[PDB]
A paper describes a structure:
The trimeric S protein mediates SARS-CoV-2 entry into host cells via the RBD, which binds to the angiotensin-converting enzyme 2 (ACE2) receptor. Three representative bnAbs, X01, X10, and X17, were further identified to offer potent cross-neutralizing activity against most VOCs but with a decreased neutralization breadth against Omicron. High-resolution cryo-electron microscopy (cryo-EM) structures revealed three nonoverlapping conserved epitopes and defined the structural basis for the neutralization breadth of the three bnAbs. Based on the previous categorization strategy, the nAbs X10, X01, and X17 are most likely classified as class 3, class 4, and class 5, respectively.
Author numbering:
A (entry chain L): 1 to 111
B (entry chain D), G (entry chain B): 1 to 107
C (entry chain G): 333 to 526
D (entry chain A), F (entry chain C): 1 to 119
E (entry chain H): 1 to 121
């Protein structure tokens, strides 16, 4: 099975600067044309919602500030403006084999 | 060495009508049947691989049918390019025996 | 009186890929091989070393049921002796094979209008495979450029490339869910019967 | 690359039991057989048995049928042979070996544990 | 728009079966899978498995072949999940995701409310 | 395209031996069982056997195992049949024909050669 | 119970020599005999798997032959790397019974 662990699990950021949440994979979950890791967002008391599909291509209906990238095993997320709307947990994912495992997820608390 | 038969070696129908060829097999074959068409002086061509599935490149007037031991072919409305023989074939056990055959003539 | 499941490896819902093929060893059976025949859906049913009318009247020691999804064209590399990408880098059958390569057609199942990037196959390897050998090393491949640092530049590729499975591809680029039954005919206590 | 690393040498008293180990890592352990072999010093190998770790099935021989029992661990990717009711008979080198296609020999070989029995 | 609705919350006695509904509304039913996701009070999300309505089967995670099953009703556009043989640790909130066309899912687009499930006496 | 050509018509006396070629070009020659079949004039077809081209392992019919023997050459992409000890009863048209490129069942014949009218 | 009957227990020559090693089967084992190689520290590795020359990752000196019930491995030219006890094997019935072993040592 493929396990994912996200570090830093405790991320506190001020309103001006960017964030950087990581997803480290076990196997090289990557091919020559796709990267098989996705990103999510979960507010407390809310169902999750998609941010990215296939680790770079951006989902329709987002504020166009969440855009991550990564090659091979290490993948990162970038949120350059941060607001009060971005106070939630952000899970990772992979779609390599048939157990799809969501990651742990880090809480982004504004300063 | 399974034997396979046909109804008549000559089945003569008129133009545009219907023809129903009959092929009875000796032993039990599940669906593994073929058909052919040999216009005289040339090589045969596979028409209906399997008992019902038509191959790519044949007109859709042809329609295989039947199961068990007796299978039938049926042409919807005959033209003048289908006045050849029609060999029934099994492919179950190794001596993949062909049928008798029925040359056609318009009447 | 227990009939061993071909309802778990044949009409399964999702087949694994070519670089990682499944295998379910089937043992202690009354094996009804008659549901395999009575279908026109099974496109190719080639049995090597054993006549297909005598499957119901034979007893073996082990039955290996391998499973994967390849293109239409490649359903003729799963055979003793052939070469090509599927049969040297992904899944090689031995020369003295005693099995029954079965493969139907499923384009209603394994294809999307934009593409199906789940099934993958291998592209390059240093040595071609030994019989029944499986490797799932997805490392960023050493093809040359002898200092390799992972970042996938010139002369270093990923060893997997996905399939493009759309309904509008013809027949040569459609998924054909192969199942390779492999009988182990070794002089032993006979396990699977008729 | 694939290697089969085996345990170290052991000591056993007559009446006790040893449980050897051969950690298979480098290929798919749960797909192919794992065959234990026995070499008395100065003589050829003798096939003790084999184990298919996918379902946990055993192929014992007739002589080693009840003293030797085979179990394997799917998660840890290693195989165990449990010699019970020992004697001065079983002072021999025990090997582990396995391959993908059994009609084409046994490809990968272990190192071998030297088992001594005295007091 | 495309949206999914589940049943209400429910408390569970140990050793019982609960049928979790998921009523979908807004798209053609037989072109999209319905996966189920379990999340246990702030722990990590885990994938149970999804149905394939054009094929008529399901693909469970191997740690959930024992206690989960997926049945759908193609006429009234509802997908069900029944949990049997449950311990007390299998008390969570259960989500009803939406995937892609069959054996092609990689992301989960639209989600439901989620029925929180509690096990006690 | 997928083209199969053979030799021309033959003419030998009773009690002789012939061989006719069958040169395949347009596909991977090592990947189809090249069959054979005999068709007398005004009657149905009758089998001879098949040869698997990468190995050379031949299978023959029951009534034809004495006369016809097949061989193959992977370099020239030719499949030969060697007919021995003929009569006037063995005067027919001989085809070489592979199976369908996407069908795969062991006995259908989806593209046929021309035919050498042997006398 | 096929029992392999390896003929010799010790065979000696010098460098540059061509040395064959024989192994005789009990019944008709029908070309499923291997050949192994054991350097004295304890490492064992396969040399040829099928009888008919198919070798696995070794130098091309080792090439055995034979059919029926009599088989023999041979080395074209040997060196100081080629010192071992060489087992034969049978693969058609249980139990897999190995040969005795011909110890090599430089004369
Ligand atoms: C798989 O399921 C279908 C559905 O009824 C059935 O027709 C078919 O025979 C099954 N195949 C096997 C091998 O059991």
């Amino acid at each position: 099975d493929i396990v994912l662990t996200q570090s830093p699990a405790s991320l506190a950021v001020s309103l001006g600067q960017r964030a950087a949440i990581s997803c480290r994979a076990s196997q090289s979950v990557s091919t020559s044309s796709h990267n098989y890791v996705h990103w999510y967002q979960q507010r407390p008391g809310q169902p999750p919602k998609l941010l990215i599909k296939y680790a770079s291509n951006l989902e329709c209906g987002v504020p166009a500030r969440f855009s991550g990238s990564g090659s091979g095993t290490d993948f990162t997320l970038n949120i350059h403006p941060v607001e009060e709307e971005d106070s939630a947990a952000y899970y990772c994912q992979h779609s390599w084999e048939i157990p799809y495992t969501f990651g742990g997820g880090t809480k982004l608390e504004i300063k | 060495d399974i034997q396979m038969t046909q109804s008549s070696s000559y089945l003569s129908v008129s133009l545009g009508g219907r023809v129903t060829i009959t092929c009875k097999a000796s032993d039990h074959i599940n669906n593994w049947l073929a058909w052919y068409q040999q216009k005289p002086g040339n090589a045969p061509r596979l028409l209906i691989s399997g008992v019902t599935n038509l191959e790519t490149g044949v007109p859709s007037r042809f329609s295989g049918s039947g199961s068990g031991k007796n299978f039938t072919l049926s042409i919807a409305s005959l033209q003048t390019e289908d006045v050849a023989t029609y060999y029934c074939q099994q492919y179950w056990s190794f001596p993949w025996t062909f049928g008798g055959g029925t040359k056609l003539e318009i009447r | 009186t227990n009939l061993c499941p071909f309802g778990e490896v044949f009409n399964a819902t999702r087949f694994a890929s070519v670089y990682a093929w499944n295998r379910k060893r089937i043992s202690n059976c009354v094996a009804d091989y008659s549901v395999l025949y009575n279908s026109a859906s099974f496109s190719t049913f080639k049995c090597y070393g054993v006549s297909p009318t005598k499957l119901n009247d034979l007893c073996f020691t082990n039955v290996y049921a391998d499973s994967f999804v390849i293109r239409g064209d490649e359903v003729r590399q799963i055979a003793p002796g052939q070469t090509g990408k599927i049969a040297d880098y992904n899944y090689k059958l031995p020369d003295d094979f005693t099995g029954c390569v079965i493969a139907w057609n499923s384009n209603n199942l394994d294809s999307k209008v934009g593409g199906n990037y789940n099934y993958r196959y291998r592209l390059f390897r240093k040595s071609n495979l030994k019989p029944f050998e499986r490797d799932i090393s997805t490392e960023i491949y050493q093809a040359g450029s002898k200092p390799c640092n992972g970042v996938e530049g010139f002369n270093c590729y990923f060893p997997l490339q996905s399939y493009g499975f759309q309904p509008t591809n013809g027949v040569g680029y459609q998924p054909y869910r192969v199942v390779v039954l492999s009988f182990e005919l070794l002089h032993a206590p006979a396990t699977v019967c008729g | 690359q694939v290697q089969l690393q085996q345990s170290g040498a052991e000591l056993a008293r007559p009446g006790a039991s040893v449980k050897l180990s051969c950690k298979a890592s480098g290929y798919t352990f749960t797909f192919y057989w794992m065959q234990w072999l026995k070499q008395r010093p100065g003589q050829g190998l003798e096939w003790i048995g084999a184990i298919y770790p996918g379902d946990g099935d055993t192929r014992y021989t007739q002589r080693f049928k009840d003293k030797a029992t085979l179990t394997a661990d799917k998660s840890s990717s290693t195989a165990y042979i449990q010699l019970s009711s020992l004697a001065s008979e079983d002072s021999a080198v025990y090997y582990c070996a396995g391959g993908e296609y059994d009609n084409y020999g046994f490809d990968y070989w272990g190192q071998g544990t030297t088992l001594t029995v005295s007091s | 728009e495309v949206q999914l609705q589940q049943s209400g919350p429910e408390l569970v006695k140990p050793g019982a079966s609960v049928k979790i509904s998921c009523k979908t509304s807004g798209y053609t039913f037989t072109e999209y899978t319905l996966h189920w996701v379990k999340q246990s009070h702030g722990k990590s999300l885990e994938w149970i498995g999804g149905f394939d309505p054009n094929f008529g089967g399901a693909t469970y995670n191997l740690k959930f072949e024992d206690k989960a099953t997926l049945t759908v009703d193609k006429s009234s556009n509802t997908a069900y999940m029944e949990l049997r043989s449950l311990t007390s640790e299998d008390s969570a909130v259960f989500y009803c995701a939406r995937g892609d066309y069959g054996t092609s899912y990689a992301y989960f687009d639209f989600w439901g409310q989620g029925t929180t499930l509690t096990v006690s006496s | 395209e997928i083209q199969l050509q053979q030799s021309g018509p033959e003419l030998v006396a009773p009690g002789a031996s012939v061989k006719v070629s069958c040169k395949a070009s347009g596909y991977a020659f090592t990947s189809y069982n090249m069959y054979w079949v005999r068709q007398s004039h005004g009657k149905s077809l009758e089998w001879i056997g098949y040869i698997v081209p990468y190995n050379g392992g031949t299978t023959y019919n029951q009534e034809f195992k004495g006369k016809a023997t097949l061989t193959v050459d992977k370099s020239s992409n030719t499949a030969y049949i060697h007919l021995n000890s003929l009569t006037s009863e063995d005067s027919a048209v001989y085809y070489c024909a592979k199976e369908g490129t996407y069908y795969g069942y062991d006995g259908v014949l989806a593209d046929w050669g021309q035919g050498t009218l042997v006398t | 119970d096929i029992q392999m009957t390896q003929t010799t227990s010790s065979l000696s020559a010098s460098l540059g020599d061509r040395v064959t090693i024989s192994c005789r089967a009990s019944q008709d084992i029908s070309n499923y005999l291997n050949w192994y190689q054991q350097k004295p520290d304890g490492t064992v590795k396969l040399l040829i798997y099928y009888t008919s020359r198919l070798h696995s990752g070794v130098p091309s000196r080792f090439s055995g032959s034979g059919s029926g019930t009599d088989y023999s491995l041979t080395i074209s030219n040997l060196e100081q790397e080629d010192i071992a006890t060489y087992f034969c094997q049978q693969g058609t019935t249980l139990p897999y019974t190995f040969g005795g072993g011909t110890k090599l040592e430089i004369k």
